[model samples]
Target: THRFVQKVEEMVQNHMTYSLQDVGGDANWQLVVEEGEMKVYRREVEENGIVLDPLKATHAVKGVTGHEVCNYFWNVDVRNDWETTIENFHVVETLADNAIIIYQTHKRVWPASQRDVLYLSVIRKIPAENDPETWIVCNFSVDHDSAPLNNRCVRAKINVAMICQTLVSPEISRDNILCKITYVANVNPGGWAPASVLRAVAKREYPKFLKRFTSYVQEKTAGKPILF
Candidate 1:
């Protein structure tokens, strides 16, 4: 795990500042976050034979949005609450086939609280990003009956931010010129909140987050190239 952490740190130090467009023109990359909602589906096939369709859970959000481009690289530092559930989380480039990989280092802060931190990194790239229709989605269920507060609560949160260095191009439509970063968090609070609460939160927060993310990028890369 230490190796994985080191690898990500190195990549962030060297490559996080570069624009996705400059990294791969006309190519789109998606970054996804989830609490293991989908079950991996696998089908065995004879040699050289096609495998049957493998049912898979969808991601909450997918595809490379302008916001994601700005905030994909982050420093994950957490304290207290739910036992450092996820730490040192990051995306890294892979050598085998130009894919982005996700890795998480975890540690337990209960009972003895002995340093049980695990450090490791994994790399897996989502499919190509040029296709506008294609996107990533995450699916998970919440148990309202067993909620901690007895309030029947099931919720998920997704945050995305991005930055663009170049000024808006007159050639591109405003809708197209602006980066489109979307967040969809689904929550089901029994007898109190509607299922649409999460989606609504996403819609409300996206515009503000996008604005901040873009400004950050503009400031950070003031003298850098945003496009090829």
Candidate 2:
């Protein structure tokens, strides 16, 4: 019973530490996009002789609670309604209360086959020490192999970590809390897809992914009860 809990805690800690330590050179990390309420940054890093790109995005807005925004990601079933790149998504297994292994196949690029990912994921609410009203949801990813690669789809072992910090003011309604979201993801599109193509996809789809998900959450939670 406690083993599963400890396992997930260790899982979260690994992601947190990795996110903090692997801050690549700002000089190398390219700032690709700066749009309204969202800033996307990315840099190339080699992993196992493969040049993979990791993207970081920051979006702060006053509308949704921290829990509501993060709930969108944790709710694996409703993701396709928001995440356009996901061709198919489902939970392979639930590891713990807030952890699971997911199977995902992203939309097909004409030049390359459709990509599928199997990864262990966990999201938890971390209360901030500095401010009583400040809360965070740490969503982290680990590698999984249960959903084996098939001839129909390419296996991409991508890893992701996201931190959503919610700042709330008691004066304002709970629904009106401001969420400062930070998303960083490393994409390792398996198979022999050209580096140029993978890099281009990272630059284009990531910013749109953030924008679309936020819009979807805003729409889904309208006039609904607070979800925390």
- RMSD to the true structure for each prediction, in A, is 15.5, 3.2
TM-score of 2: 0.83
Q: Where does candidate 1 stray beyond 4 Å?
A: 1-98, 103-193
Worst 10 residues of 2 by lDDT: 132-141
In order, what lDDT does every prediction score? 0.28, 0.70
User: Model 2, 56: alpha-carbon shift in Å?
Assistant: 1.0
- Provide the lDDT at 70 for model 2: 77
How far does residue 202 in candidate 2 sit from its true spot (Å)?
1.0
Please give the lDDT score for candidate 1: 0.28
Number of backbone-clashing residue pairs for each candidate, in the order shown: 18, 0
Query: What's each prediction's TM-score?
Result: 0.27, 0.83
* lDDT per residue (tens digit) for residues 1-228 in model 1: 332345444432332233122311222322222233211121221222311211211112222233333233231221122222344433333322212333333332232121111122222222323433212222222122222221112222211112222123443333333333222222222122222442243333333343443345445444444321
- What is the TM-score of candidate 1? 0.27
* Native-to-model Cα distance after best TM-score fit, residue 78 in candidate 1, in Å: 16
lDDT of 2 at 110: 70
In model 2, the Cα lDDT at residue 11 comes to: 50
